[PDB]
Write a protein that binds this DNA or RNA. Structure first.
Ligand SMILES: [Mg+2]
Ligand SMILES: [Mg+2]
Ligand SMILES: [Mg+2]
Lengths: 136, 177, 116, 76, 50
RNA sequence: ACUUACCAACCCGAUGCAAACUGCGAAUACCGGAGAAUGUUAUCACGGGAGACACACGGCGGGUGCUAACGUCCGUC
RNA sequence: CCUCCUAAAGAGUAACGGAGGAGCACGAAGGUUGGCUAAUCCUGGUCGGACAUCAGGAGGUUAGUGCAAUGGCAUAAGCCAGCUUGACUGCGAGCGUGACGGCGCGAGCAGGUGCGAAAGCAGGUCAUAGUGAUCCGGUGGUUCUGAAUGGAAGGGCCAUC
RNA sequence: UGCCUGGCGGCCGUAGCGCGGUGGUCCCACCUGACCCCAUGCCGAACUCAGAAGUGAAACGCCGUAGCGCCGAUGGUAGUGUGGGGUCUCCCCAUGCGAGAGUAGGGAACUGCCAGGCA
């Protein structure tokens, strides 16, 4: 599961998901998977979508993960009043903007890329699309 | 100053024609010889610290500074500013007289002596060395010893390369490797 | 380094006289010669300058720089300063000790009648 | 772990901005370290508080080889 | 607490005294300081550090 | 004295993320000066008498909560 | 009570919001004068290794600063030595910050000193926590008062517990 | 007035570093000597004294070089005041101001007083 091994502080504020993305072009491989919608990707969603494609793109080529969560979300458990400080850390999320390249793949045919990225788009809570590396 | 006069007469004209310098001040020259003694053991007992001071001042001819430690760390068991060694830097007349007494009586009377190492340079043209079993020094009597001690003879040279540092000892004849 | 350690040593004494707006008397010491200049508080111009590389001073000197030469040029700057009338200049040691020719150049100018 | 303390916020910041004519002795900038440095007619306090030493306007300059900020007072 | 209070007593005829604190545990030596006595208007010897 | 299908710090190139990172950097807001127009002094000082100190929701900037609450706590309107 | 963030590029700004820390230490760890420049790494090498101490080179404050954290610090506020007590007294223009009680900065002047040759600097410490209002008394000083007078008791003033 | 050098500045990397070349009549630097004035928390290295035998090496000054640091547009993008609107966790429209990074490119500083040497 993708999570930071060590942080300077345990907790973090809620924040917002405003602004545009900066991960625009594929710069590691030739094929990419770019996010269209807006939302957050939890630690389970990034791990499951990596497992979802890897089944069909068997052991050749190379897959990069362009994002990293670096943001915890705390929860208040059931039958607990409001207050009593901030709750305990449960799972890590990543702030994702429209235009962020999430998943990349190289060393595969283009027809194989269309299949695996379709199989990983259902596991993601936001809409995605297929992109291809353009030079310069 | 027997080797100081020998420097100007023989050593300067030797390196003038060997490495074809345009200026005669481009010759390598000696600056200092720092006679050091890192006694080290003086955490437990302080009586070996004062004895190390008098032994290093017998090899040299003047009073040392008891050296304070570099930086306090816990894994190396030393404290900030702790007296743990003693050194003497010789410049001038004391430097040339000790360098003659180093090479002709102390160095040849080392047992199992085959020669110094010709690759013991720092990388820029300075040479460090040590001589074993300090009974070879004629100043230390065999009855007044407490334990084997230390010394770090380093030749500070204004040369710019190791090859220029090799040729300066060759005129001092540095017996050989 | 040799020269840059002298500059950082004097720098506290340089900018302190800048904060007071007084006229400073800097010195430069050389194994050959010695210099002394009376500087305006802006620092970009001088008013009284006399050294031992000038032939007017070196004729009466056996060697160009010693404690006897610093007494000569210390008076020489001070005599040119009284002809101008800068009258309570400040003394800048400029990174050297106040023991040798820096002291000899200062005490000679104290004898002439400058207020420092 | 057992958090929930905060001190009284000390009233720092710039109290006299540039272009303002101040009196001799007025406090220009309250600060902890030398965020601002003393310059012309500006004294540095014990707690690094920069104050006025002459009647005039506040002038901010960035001088020195280390690119540090200064406060100077020009005569009105 | 551990830190005790002492009074620096003037050695002159005046009974003017200042106040300060010293560590009695590790520093039992009597303090020796010259301070301004506002009565005699001079600097005088101060003693008696407990 | 060398090397092997071994593990691997630092360094270098490429690429992200951070309320408690800033080698960078706004919009406006704020502070001061000058100027015209406008406004029944709208401003400050001082005096007589208060009431109020349970606020609500909506837009926006947030903390908290599940980017749940006609939820809670602030800033601003 | 202190530090940072929440705090939305002035100040101010809440919550059982997020991370810590203080109830001191210090006569030098203060003042002043004179000096001094680390962290890490390479190479060299009687005891000697992972470190005892050094030499030069690379590196130029990532080191250090009695401690929590931030903001500072090379002119070093960092470090060392000599000489010392300004951790002075009576004052204080002007200003910051408070509803208030109050707190904080502050040149300069008067008196007498310390250091330096001198210009100058010094009314504590790199700054921000190290604190208890008042009533009531205890101690020292001061004819200020002295219930008829002269004292005294008590009180006040100042220093202090 | 030119060239070269020193001192104190203005300015604070378009002023730095690295590389290559060069300067010794003067200047500066190293160097010579040191019982002494003094100095070293050891040490004539530094500090400082007395001298000029030697020298442009280290350092410094200048010239040349775009490896690096740095400076840096135009346009575009992100953001935002005011007003309006939507599929209202967010974004668009009208108007005002305009980034950061990156690119083209700039760039081996400039300048003031005074003194010395050469012509
Ligand atoms: Mg010398
Ligand atoms: Mg050269
Ligand atoms: Mg730009």
């Amino acid at each position: 599961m993708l999570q930071p091994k060590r942080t300077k502080f345990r907790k973090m504020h809620k924040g917002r998901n405003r602004g545009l993305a900066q991960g625009t072009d594929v710069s590691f491989g030739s094929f990419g998977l770019k996010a269209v919608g807006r939302g957050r990707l939890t630690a389970r969603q990034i791990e499951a979508a990596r497992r979802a494609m890897t089944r069909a793109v068997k052991r050749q080529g190379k897959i990069w993960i362009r994002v990293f969560p670096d943001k915890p979300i705390t929860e208040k458990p059931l039958a607990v009043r409001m207050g009593k400080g901030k709750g305990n850390v449960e799972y890590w999320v990543a702030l994702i903007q429209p235009g962020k390249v999430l998943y990349e793949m190289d060393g595969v045919p283009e027809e194989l890329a269309r299949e695996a990225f379709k199989l990983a788009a259902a596991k993601l809570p936001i809409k995605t699309t297929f992109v291809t590396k353009t030079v310069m | 100053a027997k080797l100081h006069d020998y420097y100007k007469d023989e050593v300067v004209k030797k390196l003038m024609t060997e490495f074809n310098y345009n200026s005669v001040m481009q010759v390598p020259r000696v600056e200092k010889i720092t006679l050091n003694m890192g006694v080290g053991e003086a955490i437990a007992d302080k009586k070996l610290l004062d004895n190390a001071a008098a032994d290093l001042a017998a090899i040299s001819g003047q009073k040392p500074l008891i050296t304070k430690a570099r930086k306090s760390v816990a894994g190396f068991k030393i404290r900030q500013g702790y007296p743990i060694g003693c050194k003497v830097t010789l410049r001038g007349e004391r430097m040339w007289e000790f360098f003659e007494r180093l090479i002709t009586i102390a160095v040849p009377r080392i047992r199992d002596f085959r020669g110094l190492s010709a690759k013991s340079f720092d990388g820029r043209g300075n040479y460090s060395m040590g001589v074993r079993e300090q009974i070879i020094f004629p100043e230390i009597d065999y009855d007044k010893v407490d334990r084997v001690r230390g010394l770090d003879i380093t030749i500070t040279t204004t040369a710019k390369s190791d090859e220029e540092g090799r040729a300066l000892l060759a005129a001092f004849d540095f017996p050989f490797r | 380094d040799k020269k840059s350690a002298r500059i950082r040593r004097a720098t506290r004494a340089r900018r302190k006289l800048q904060e007071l707006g007084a006229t400073r008397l800097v010195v430069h010491r050389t194994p050959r010669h010695i210099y002394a200049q009376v500087i305006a508080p802006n620092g970009s111009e001088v008013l009284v300058a006399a050294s031992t590389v000038e032939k007017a001073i070196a004729e009466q000197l056996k060697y160009t720089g010693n404690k006897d030469a610093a007494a000569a040029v210390g008076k020489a700057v001070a005599e040119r300063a009284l002809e101008k009338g800068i009258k309570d200049v400040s003394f800048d040691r400029s990174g050297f000790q106040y023991h040798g020719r820096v002291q000899a150049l200062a005490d000679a100018a104290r004898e002439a009648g400058l207020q420092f | 772990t057992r958090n929930g303390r905060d001190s009284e916020a000390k009233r720092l910041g710039v109290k006299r901005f540039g272009g303002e004519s101040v009196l001799a002795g007025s406090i220009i900038v309250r600060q902890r370290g030398t965020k601002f440095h003393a310059g012309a007619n500006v004294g540095c306090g014990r707690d690094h508080t920069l104050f006025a030493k002459a009647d005039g306007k506040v002038k901010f300059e960035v001088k020195g080889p280390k690119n540090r900020k200064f406060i100077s007072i020009e005569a009105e | 607490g551990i830190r005790e209070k002492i009074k620096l007593v003037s050695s002159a005829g005046t009974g003017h005294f200042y106040t300060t604190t010293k560590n009695k545990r590790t520093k039992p030596e009597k303090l020796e300081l010259k301070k301004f006595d506002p009565v005699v208007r001079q600097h005088v010897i101060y003693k008696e550090a407990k």
